[PDB]
Structure formats: structure tokens, C-alpha cells
Design a protein around this ligand. Structure first.
Ligand SMILES: Nc1nc2c(ncn2[C@@H]2O[C@H](COP(=O)(O)OP(=O)(O)O)[C@@H](O)[C@H]2O)c(=O)[nH]1
Ligand SMILES: [Mg+2]
Length: 165
């Protein structure tokens, strides 16, 4: 039985909570509350005879209060940095979050980059090619995801579970 704190980071409204709720609760909503606070969810996945138990922390308010972020990712063994593929600024912001984790999070943290809202590719602003090369250059797990269609949601968390010590 392995236990790992997993956190999500990214600009407001990229779909951090939606990804958690799809993975944990098999739910998606076009409306999602964004009220300041934190939720502690748990999700256990299995790999052979190994039980990977995620402690999933999801928070609202780190966009308003960026300097409080260290309180949130401290002790995190995994992080999902999320951007919205239809918003170039969220991708730039994701890169900042990745940089911060590299400088300030545990040195062995597993970081995945999630190109979210992939179901909205009609308005794509971030090319997968570019994000892929970025992730490769930084040794990041990377997938495009959708909380709405669940595309790659199971995949991204299983990949994290596999990459963890
Ligand atoms: N179409 C689509 N909408 C999404 C997706 N993920 C999140 N959203 C929407 O984006 C808005 C913000 O989502 P939320 O999970 O609260 O983002 P957060 O602030 O990062 O936690 C909500 O209206 C969601 O329904 C997705 O994969 N596809
Ligand atoms: Mg949220």
C-alpha cells in the first residue's frame, strides 16, 4: 500500500476541479463552483500487487493568492499542471507553475502536464506538438485531456501512478 499526495495547479477555469471530479466521481458539469477553499479526495488505483492510494487535493484561490501556493504543494509527490488548449495564456501560466514546482516542490515530485478541454479543439490555440516538445524538454508526463468526454483522464492518473516511486 503506497500513499501519495497529488495536487492540481493551473489558471482559474482551466478545468482542475472538473478533471478531479471526472476521475473520482465519474461526473462532469458545465457549471462548477469556484469558491475559495480546498477539497481532499481519495482515489485508489491498482498496479499488479501494488495499491497506489492518491490523496487528491483540489483548491480554489491560488490565482487570487499566488504566494500561498507553497502551503498547498508542500509534501506533494505528484502534480498535474493543467492548461486549456483553447487559451495560449493558460499554457504560459502552466509553464510558470511547472517552473515553480521545479524550484520549490519536493525534488522527486512527479509532474504531469494536462492539455485540457480537448473536446473544444475547434478553438485550439495551443498545438499539441509545441506542448509535447515542452514536456519532453522538461521530463514531464503530458496528455491532452477532457473532463467532459473523460478523454485521457484515466490515462493521465494511471501514468502518474506508474511513474511514482
Ligand atoms: N468543454 C469542456 N469544458 C470544461 C472541461 N473542463 C472544465 N470545463 C469547464 O470549465 C469551467 C471551469 O472548470 P473548473 O473545473 O471549475 O476549473 P478550475 O477553476 O480550474 O477548477 C467549467 O464551466 C467547466 O464545465 C472540458 O474538458 N471540456
Ligand atoms: Mg476549481
Amino acid at each position: 500500500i503506497c500513499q501519495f499526495k497529488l495536487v492540481l495547479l493551473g489558471e482559474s477555469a482551466v478545468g482542475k476541479s472538473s478533471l478531479v471530479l471526472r476521475f473520482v466521481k465519474g461526473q462532469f458539469h458545465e457549471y462548477q463552483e469556484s469558491t475559495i477553499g480546498a477539497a481532499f479526495l481519495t482515489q485508489t488505483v491498482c498496479l499488479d500487487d501494488t495499491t497506489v492510494k492518491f490523496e487528491i487535493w483540489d483548491t480554489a484561490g491560488l490565482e487570487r493568492y499566488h504566494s500561498l501556493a507553497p502551503m498547498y504543494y508542500r509534501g506533494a509527490q505528484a502534480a498535474i499542471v493543467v492548461y486549456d488548449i483553447t487559451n495560449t495564456d493558460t499554457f504560459a501560466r502552466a509553464k510558470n507553475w511547472v517552473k515553480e514546482l521545479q524550484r520549490q516542490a519536493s525534488p522527486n515530485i512527479v509532474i504531469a502536464l494536462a492539455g485540457n478541454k480537448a473536446d473544444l479543439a475547434s478553438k485550439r490555440a495551443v498545438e499539441f506538438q509545441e506542448a509535447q516538445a515542452y514536456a519532453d524538454d522538461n521530463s514531464l508526463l503530458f496528455m491532452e485531456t477532457s473532463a467532459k468526454t473523460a478523454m485521457n483522464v484515466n490515462e493521465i492518473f494511471m501514468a502518474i501512478a506508474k511513474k511514482l516511486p
